[PDB]
Each structure stands twice: as C-alpha cells, then as structure tokens.
Amino acid sequence: KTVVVTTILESPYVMMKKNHEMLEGNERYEGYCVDLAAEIAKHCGFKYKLTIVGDGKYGARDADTKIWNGMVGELVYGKADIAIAPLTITLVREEVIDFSKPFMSLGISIMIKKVSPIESAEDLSKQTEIAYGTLDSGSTKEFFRRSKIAVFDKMWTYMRSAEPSVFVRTTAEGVARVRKSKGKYAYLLESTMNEYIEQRKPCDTMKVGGNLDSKGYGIATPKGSSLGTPVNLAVLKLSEQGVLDKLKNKWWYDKGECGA
Amino acid sequence: KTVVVTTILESPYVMMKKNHEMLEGNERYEGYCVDLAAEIAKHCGFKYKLTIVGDGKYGARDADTKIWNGMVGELVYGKADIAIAPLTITLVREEVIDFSKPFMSLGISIMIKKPQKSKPLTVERMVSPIESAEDLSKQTEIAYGTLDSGSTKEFFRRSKIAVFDKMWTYMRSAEPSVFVRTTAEGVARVRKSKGKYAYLLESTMNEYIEQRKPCDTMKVGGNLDSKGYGIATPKGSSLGTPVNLAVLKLSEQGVLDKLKNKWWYDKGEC
Amino acid sequence: KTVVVTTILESPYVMMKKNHEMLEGNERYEGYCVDLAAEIAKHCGFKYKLTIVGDGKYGARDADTKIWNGMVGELVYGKADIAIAPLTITLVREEVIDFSKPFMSLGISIMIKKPQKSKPLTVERMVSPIESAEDLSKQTEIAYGTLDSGSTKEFFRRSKIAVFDKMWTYMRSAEPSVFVRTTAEGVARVRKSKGKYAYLLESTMNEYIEQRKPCDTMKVGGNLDSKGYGIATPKGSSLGTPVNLAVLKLSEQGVLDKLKNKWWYDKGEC
C-alpha cells in the first residue's frame, strides 16, 4: 500500500528539479527531504508518495477555532501518513502528535544586510529604527508570543503593534523584503535557512549575533501510528552512520556558489 | 511513593558541597543536574531522591554476556525510575530504554595540553600541532583515546568512515591502553602527559574545564558529530511523556539556558 | 472615595500616548510619573484619577496679593488630594504644604546650543564659551533666564551669594524679558537663539533632552545647588505618612532606579 507523505516545497530540503514539466513519479524531486524519505522507505520497505500541503504553511492554531493547518493538519485529519519536512519541534505540537529524534539542530537567528551596530538582540530590542519580523504560522512567532523574558516580551509587543503587517508568506518573501529594505528590516528566522540564504547569490545578506535559543527539526507522525518507532529508529541509525551529515554537506556546501 | 534518580558526580552537572559531610538528603549535591531535577519535580508533582551508582559508568553492553551496565543497566533492570544525568542518546540505548528530547547539545571534541606562547610586533601567536581529526589520524607520535563504556567509544567502534575506522583500529590495538575510566582521569592524563596525549570527550565538559582554573588545557577542531543529552526512562513507563513535556517546557522557558550560563560561564575567570 | 492626582505634562515624567484620542481614563498618559502613581496605588490601597491643571504652573506666591498658584495652590485650597509630579521641595512650600522624602535628585544646570566641531592628528575637540556660573555672570553678550513661577527663580531671587545676586539683578531688569513660561519654551528659545541664550533648568530634564533626538543641545558646568523632587500633600492630611513610607519603600526596592533607566537612557540614541 502506497504511503502518502506531506511536506512543503522548501529549499534546500525539497526542490522541483529543473524540467518539472516533463517529470513524474518519485524521481521528479531532488533534495534533502526527498532523499531522506527514499532512505526511510528503503529501510522500512514500504512504497511512499510525496505530496505538498495546499497552503504554504507549517501549522498553527487558529483563534477560537482549535483546528490544525499546514502539515500537521494533513497528518491529524487523515490526509497524510508521515511528514518528512523541516518541521520544528515545540511543546504545542508534541501534545497533538509525536516527533522523532531531531535530525538538524538550530536556533533563532537575526539576518541583516552586509561592524554591526546592533550585534546582540538586546540592542535590536532597544533600537526600534530597524524593524524585525517573522514567518506566519511557523514556530518563531509562537516562541516569541509566549515568552516571559522581558526582552522577548518587548519584542513580541513590538511585533503585534506593527504597521503594516510585518509577517511574510514565505521565507523567500522574507529575504526579499530584507534585501529591498536596504538594511532597515531585520528577519528573525531559523539558522539553517539564514545560512542557506547567506551562502548563495548575491551573498548580500549575513547573520548577526548568536542564537536566541536552541531548537530542532523532527519527522512528525500521526498520534497513535505504528510507523513512529521504525522511523525514529531509522533517524537514529542515519545520525549514527553520518548519512544525515553527508546529505547536509551534499545539499549545503558541495555547490557553494559564493566566496567564503 | 518516592522515585529514585540516577545521576553521576560529573562537573559541572553535579558537585559536592563544602559542608556535605554533616548534610544529608538532597542538600548533599549541587550543580546543573540537581537544579534540573528540582525543576522537573516542580513541573510534575513527585518526590525525588538523588542516587549515585557505585560503578559510576554511563552504560554499555558487555560483549559475550549481553548485559547492560551503568545507568542504562540500572534503568533497564527495574532498580531505577529516572536518569536525570548527562546520558547520551544513541541508537543502541533507544532499543532498550525510552529517551526524551535532548536538553543539551554536545559534540565529540579533542583535549590537548595548551602550548606556551612563542616569543617571535610585540604580539603573541598560538602554535598547535593538531587542527582537525584527519591530521590526528595521520599523525602517530601523540596517542589518543576515549572513555570506557561511553557513547564516544561505541560511536567510534561502529563507524564506516575511513578516518574514524582508522582511529578505532589504532585504539583497539594500542599498548599501553589509551582508554580511561573517568573524565577526570582523562583530563589528568592530558595534563600530566606533557602534550603526548589527546582526549576525545564531549564539548560541554571540554569547555567547562577550559574555562576553569588553572586553565592549562585547550580544545582544538570542531565537533566530530552532533548528539544530545537526554533524560532516560524505562521502556513502557508512565514517566516518559510527562518528563518529555517538562523538558520541552523548560527549554521553551529559557531555564535551561539560564542554568547553562549560571554553571558554565558565571564561574569562569580564564 | 477616589482621590485626585495633580500632574504636569512634562517629559519624560508624563507623555501623551499616540492613540489617546479614543482612550479615556488613566490610559491617556504614560511616562515616569504615571508609573510612580501606579506604584503608589499598589503600595497603599486607594483609587487615583490623573488630573492636569489648566494653568500648567508648578507653584509660586504672587506678590502684593498673596495667592498660591499651580499645584501648590491647588493642594493648599483643598481642591486636590495629592501631587505626584516633579515638584521641588523648598522652604516656602514646606510652610504651607506637607512634603515627603524626595524621590529624585536634581540640580540647577545650564542649557546652551551645542557648537560644531572644529577642524584643527585627525581628532575632534569641543570648544565652549561657558565653563561655570561665574563666567556666565561676568560675560554679558549671551542672555540667560529661568522659568516663571518655578523653584529656580525663587532660589535666585532670595540668594545672598554675590554671583547669584548679580544673576538675579540682571534677570529682574532684562529687556526683553529672559523668563519663559514652560520648559519646552525655554528649550525652543535655546535651539532657535543660535547660541545667544542660556536656559537654567533642572538637570533631569536637561539630560533627558540632551540624550534624545535631534540632540542639538548640551549642558555645561555642574549643578548650582542640590535639591529634590517630593510628593506634595495638604497640611494636616492623612495621606502624608503612607505616601512617605511608600516613597521610602520604592526607593529601597530599586523601582525608582529601574524607572529612571527605562525612561531616561533605554530610549536614547545620542
């Protein structure tokens, strides 16, 4: 029986290849996530099919609705069997569905135009001249929303009272807004995506400061599913063998079209 | 019913208080792990008593006997309820026990003696003989070893990478043995080897020891891999989910980071 | 019974919120003094409603007619219950009202326009024509004045010091008048006088204005004296002792320092 998989067309995790207009099957996708899905299928021994959630969202909770959108929505409501995609792990999504062991560690990063006058996020909180935003229905905004730290509370109060809407539809739109703003707009995003933007043309954006926290990416599984343990063991096996690191290097630094 | 806690006397996770001879109960110990256990107890209501295993081993499967020892064995055989200690999540351990999400990131680093500054405007430059792991594998004059019954040794013995395979081959046939029995033993070997020995230990203890007096050691290279410290729980136990949720909540609240800077950098002078 | 609070719209003590047109109640105002009033209400249980006097004067005794105006007159005649505002403790005011312990230290400083840097290795040096008060008294090309119905003017008119007597003599017979009616008016006169005018205002507002955009003003010299901002209370009232104790408790707890840093330096770029 073919197993349906939900994901999001995020680079370098998933790509559309180049001649996507004349490609079909599981060979029409290239990237970290599709290769990981193929490896998981080979290890478990099941046929898998890749699908993309119609809305370009990861998943969140609507106001006064209690409905899951994004990939977790497809997982919970019977529209998917496993989500192999860069889905951050937090407390809220852990209650509804179970996560495997993380396969990529990261944190909150600040990206800005190419010394930096803000450096630490403390100055950025204390300096309102440069704006800052996040991605809607992700995990960074959820982290900032319910943070009891004074600095993070001030940041979140800034985000909610922001004219116009500081949030963006996609991280590509976020970096586009950052580049077009000529350094007046900062982007709070995951470390991996920030570095990927940094190491590609035109190499105009750079990461500033350290990481505000520590997170990870997990392979979400429907609650009470028989496949959670096999895929968790497969993730651990890949981490032990270094296949995760090898694929990270393959899709991360093998090309390297920038001067670093 | 008060549950027991398995922990190892490892700095800065667990220390011994100065006035611990006259003190009993949970007041004997101090450090990162005791605060983590206190926060876990505050999150989910239960009574905890700190225990330290006699063998003082992290856990490994003995060959030709198939018997788990250390924390993993103590947890498997039902004589322990929780292991709030720097226990590394591995594939072999996940098959016997239940692991929550990692609460601390780590990597396999290298410990060597810090060289003296070279005299030859009036600035001092650092000279080192090791810059990565490939040169350590190629070079042979300085011996290198790992911790016995640890996660690093198990990772090295089951790695198909050429350089890691060469390191494992050297370690398994090195006379005298390059393996140590404790972290402090390895650090003492590094300090008293006069730069003739390299210790492969985790990055957290590495940086903690580097930042503390007499700060005569220094770490080289990056992390050989990426792993994390989890909280262990016996397979099919009712404490796994609440502990996992507590770890996630503590990570989100920033208490883990606060403990990290409290016990790692606030008490460092070098 | 809800008591009334007398305050002046002075920055950074009290500011007008951006969306105050559609907002009523205590939400209209923001700044140091509104937070001080909130902390006072939290300490001792009572209901407070912020009021701003129409005349907008601090308080002085009119000559030949003997009427107290401003906040002092408002509290003397019983139409107000408390004055949580930057009101200076003076000898003349203490004879008519009750003053608690000061909650902020201040001094009489000088406001002048900041000169441009001089071109003549590659460093920039600051040149100023005034370094103290004695040279200001000796020099006469640049006019200087104070605030009307303020504490500084009352201090100047009743000082036996020779230099201060000379300053008062110059001020009382200056054409056109060197006295301003508001702090903002004096700052505007300093900014638009092209360095031909000096303003004698308190050091707190002086440094707040200096630290804020467009940061085109700069303070010279030390404080002419030492005073403090108190909380006013009508003579023989039951609110004097609880307010004094609340001020002492807030000072001990460090809330006053936290408010000072929040509203004086955290919002400054120059």
Place this chain on the structure above:
Amino acid sequence: KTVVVTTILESPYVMMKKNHEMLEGNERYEGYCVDLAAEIAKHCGFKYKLTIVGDGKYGARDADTKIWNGMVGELVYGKADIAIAPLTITLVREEVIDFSKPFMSLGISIMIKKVSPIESAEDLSKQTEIAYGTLDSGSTKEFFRRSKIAVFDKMWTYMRSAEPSVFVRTTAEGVARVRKSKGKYAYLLESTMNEYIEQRKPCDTMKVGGNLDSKGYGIATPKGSSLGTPVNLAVLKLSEQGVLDKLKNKWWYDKGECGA
C-alpha cells in the same frame, strides 16, 4: 533648659579638636555636625549640649529583642532630645522616629586600592577573589540584607557566609583593613566617607564604579517631639541659603592635603 544631643565621633562630621585634654563646654568640638548644632541652636534659641553614644554604633534592631541601639536608642529611650549626626534615613528608622529633610545626598560606593578589573559591582559579585564587607549596625548591611535584586541577594549571601567576620567596628577600621589587605578586600561604604578617605593622606585608596543606590542623611528626632518642625525648617533654610554647602566646602575641600 539645656537640650542634650547625641552623636558619634565621626570625621569630618565631629572632631575632638587637638588640645581636648584642656578644653570644656561646647567649644571643645569642631566640625560639620557641631557647627550645624550651633546654627540650629542659634536659629531656635535654645541651649544645647553635645554627648556621644557610649557604643560606637548608629542603631539597628537586635535579634528577637526589639531594642534600639546606637543614637536612635538614646533618642527613643529618653536619653536624648535630638541627634545631629550623619544618620542615614531608611524605612525601618522612619517608622520609629521622624527624620528631617536630608542635608547630604550620597549612595553606596566601592573603595579599593589605587584600569580596575571589577569596575561595576556586577563583576565584583561575579568575582569572589576580592572580598567585600560593610559596617555593623549601620544602613548598608540593612540595605543588602533585604534586597530582592538577584545581584544584591548574591552579595548578601556572600556576606553572611564569610569567614572570618567581614564586618568592622568603625569605618576607620574598615579603611585600615582595606589598606592592609593590599587590594584583596573591598569596602562598601557611604560616598561621603569614601571621598573623605580619598582626599587625605596617603591618598592610597580610590572609589571604583558608580553608586549602587541613592540615600541621604537626616537629623533624627524623637517621635512626637515639638522640635521636629523647627529643626526641619532650619535645615531647609540652611539648604536654601547655601550654609550646608559652605560648611561642606569648609570641612571638605578647604584643607585638601592631597594631589587632586
């Protein structure tokens, strides 16, 4: 009727003159406090006599006894009519007796041997190599005892668990211990006393950092005394006329036997 006044032999507030073995009356004392007392007596028009509390303490609350020592003890228990001395004003003493308006503003200062590696008190709290202490039965230790700030709580926990007893009998003993310790002992003391030590021989000590708080000195009066208002008005009048500042300069910088 002669009014008795309690004080403490603290310099430059009160001196013993030089030929004290052959002096008597109110003319056997020189200094800021005796001159202030003479001015207050002249303004009010009453005969005053100066006395020193037998114990060299300002005043505090003993454990499980509720008895006032120091100068406030002499004031409360009918042994004095007014205390003209450098008595800091705080909440605890305000409840028992009333204080006039302050006549000298100051704060908590750190003194050390003659750039400084600690600078701010944050480093000193985070650096236990150099010890720090205060004066027993004063106001600095009371401020540190009941401070809810994390840094000040850490400092107070350090003071209580100090071997040997870090407290000193007198500020002169404190500066002696600081000088003999060769920079390994810091002294938390009032700004005025620290500066007075700074501006005298051998000019070996210097103040480090800013002020941890803001305080003041008041003329304590017995609770329910008819003299509180006249002396409060006299203090305000002296502050208005500049006599307080003039006496401060007279006993503070007129001599100036150091290189500044």
